[PDB]
């Protein structure tokens, strides 16, 4: 049994609301309002985030009727409007993804639509109609949080709805009607981290993977990490059909990183994983070269440029076919399929081929992995 040699402050916040709980982009909350008389829409809440892109809330009727969406794009507030076919999108205000709490609110003051950050206005858009719609002697209006009722492809300007942000002190159309605050108390999985530092956090229970092309052929991985366990798969390539692990970087003990192709190593390097410090593991591969650096300090290989070739030759042959790129772990493979196979537990940001991996952009992110927020290292 492996244990956390460097635990983190896994302290939630019962009074909050996690908008990134579900990778499927389903709204974490859906409200449906039926009101007797005309009603002005007013939503307000405290919000904290690092994720530069995401959906805060949807409010309105049917996908192609009339609605509004308040979102985060480029770390700034974006507002999309559809008042019957007529699309529209606006963006302004300050930076929101600064990690500090703040107050955001949308409302139908006058015949405009006003958006405020910290009780101060940033956007005033003119609209011609009301969000609440008359249907059978009653006015209705739906409101979803952290996601929308339909497919992003039908928005006005598509966007990856997945938003790893926290929310609290909410008030939907005036009322404290503690109904949400109640279930969120019972479901820790819905609360956020009390304190959030930058990066992506893996709790060591799942993985995420992408369909990346590596075709000559390159393979550059840069993994800023902050382990919480002595062993665990950082980066890795997987061949589905033959359940093979073409390439893989990981941690093991004593105490060191390890580049490898299938069941055989290729280079090692010692690291003090249990000092809660940010290390910069970096691997560079292509026919002829196969180096592994840790904070700018290569390690001695385990091959011989002779064996190293009866490997890179296999690797580049694997890349001639579909290959899933895994982060943090590997599907169910036999223990002898690679040097390490257990899940990584800690903070880790990956750069794969000069590109930065956005866990919201993956093909599949295990749910307990936080896309853009890591808990702090509990100082003992």
């Amino acid at each position: 049994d492996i244990l956390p040699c460097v635990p983190f402050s896994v302290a939630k916040s019962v009074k909050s609301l996690y908008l990134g709980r579900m990778f499927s982009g389903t709204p974490v909350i859906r409200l449906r309002f039926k009101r007797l008389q005309p009603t002005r829409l007013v939503a307000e809440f405290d919000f904290r985030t690092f994720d530069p892109e995401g959906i805060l809330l949807f409010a309105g009727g049917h996908q192609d009727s009339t609605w509004i969406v308040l979102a985060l794009r480029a770390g700034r507030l974006e507002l999309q409007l559809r008042y019957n076919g007529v699309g529209r999108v606006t963006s302004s205000g300050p930076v929101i993804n600064h990690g500090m709490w703040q107050t955001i609110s949308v409302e139908e003051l006058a015949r405009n639509l006003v958006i405020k950050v910290n009780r101060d206005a940033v956007m005033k858009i003119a609209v011609a109609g009301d969000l609440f719609q008359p249907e059978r002697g009653l006015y209705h209006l739906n409101l979803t949080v952290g996601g929308i009722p339909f497919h992003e492809k039908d928005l006005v300007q598509p966007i990856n709805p997945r938003l790893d942000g926290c929310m609290r002190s909410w008030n939907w159309l005036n009322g404290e009607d503690t109904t949400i605050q109640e279930t969120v108390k019972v479901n820790t999985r819905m609360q956020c981290f009390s304190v959030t530092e930058r990066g992506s956090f893996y709790p060591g229970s799942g993985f995420a993977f992408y369909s990346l092309d590596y075709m000559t052929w390159e393979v550059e991985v840069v993994a800023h990490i902050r382990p919480a366990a002595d062993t665990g798969v950082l980066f890795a390539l997987w061949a589905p059909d033959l359940r093979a692990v073409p390439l893989s970087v990981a941690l093991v003990d004593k105490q060191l990183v390890v580049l490898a192709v299938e069941h055989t190593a290729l280079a090692l390097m010692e690291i003090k994983v249990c000092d809660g410090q940010e290390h910069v593991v970096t691997v560079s591969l292509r026919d002829g070269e196969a180096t592994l650096e840790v904070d700018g300090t290569r390690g001695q290989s385990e091959v011989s440029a002779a064996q190293l070739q009866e490997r890179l030759a296999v690797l580049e042959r694997h890349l001639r076919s579909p290959v899933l790129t895994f982060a943090g772990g590997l599907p169910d493979v036999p223990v002898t399929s690679a040097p390490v196979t257990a899940f990584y537990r800690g903070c880790m940001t990956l750069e794969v081929n000069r590109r930065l991996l956005d866990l919201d952009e993956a093909a599949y992110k295990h749910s307990d992995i936080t896309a853009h927020s890591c808990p702090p290292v509990e100082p003992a």
Binding site: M22, F23, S24, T26, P27, V28, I29, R30, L31, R32, F33, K34, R35, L36, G137, L138, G175, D177, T179, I180, T183, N187, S367
Partner: protein, 191 residues
């Protein structure tokens, strides 16, 4: 079993008061729309607010629905036994019931009116007042002075004044289990 987990409570108060009833069920996949039943009938036009929270990873796993009916200006008709209703397939489900009743201070229907009568001539003043709760005891006042020991005692709903040799004034308290509500002060002008 019954999808419900939380049943309506009870709200009693004076006319005008706004309050809310709420039931909360838990279902499997895509939650049903929850309706409100009052006295066994369907409430077609009423302010309600449903809160849906997905417990699973998809929209086909367990959900938590909570619906709250809101009564704005509580009047008399809004009084009754209320309950939640959800359709799960061709089947039907109802929540335990909750009851909402009107109950506050006396409400006047008639209050002493202002008059101008000839001296030493007889006349009458009136003072009706409804509940609930009932019964409501009346009690007059002359120039800020009770005309009886306590409520319910003395004239009520109709006070006969034999005569007045000078302008005077009458009030009319109205009491009931909730408390008391005094009427306006009528001024009788003498000539």
């Amino acid at each position: 079993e019954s999808p419900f987990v939380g049943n309506p409570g009870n709200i009693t108060g004076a006319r005008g008061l706004t309050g809310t009833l709420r039931c909360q069920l838990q279902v499997q996949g895509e939650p049903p729309e929850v309706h409100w039943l009052r006295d066994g009938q369907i409430l077609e036009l009423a302010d309600s607010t449903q809160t849906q929270v997905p417990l699973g990873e998809d929209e086909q796993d367990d959900w938590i629905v909570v619906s709250q009916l809101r009564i704005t200006s509580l009047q008399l008709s809004d009084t009754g036994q209320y309950q939640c209703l959800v359709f799960l397939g061709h089947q039907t489900f109802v929540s335990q019931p909750g009851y909402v009743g009107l109950e506050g201070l006396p409400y006047f229907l008639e209050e002493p009116e202002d008059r101008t009568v000839a001296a030493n001539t007889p006349f009458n003043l009136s003072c009706q007042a409804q509940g609930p709760p009932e019964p409501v005891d009346l009690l007059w006042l002359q120039d800020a002075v009770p005309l009886a020991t306590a409520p319910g005692h003395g004239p009520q709903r109709s006070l006969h004044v034999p005569g007045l040799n000078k302008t005077s004034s009458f009030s009319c308290e109205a009491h009931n289990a909730k408390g008391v509500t005094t009427s306006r002060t009528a001024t009788i002008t003498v000539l």
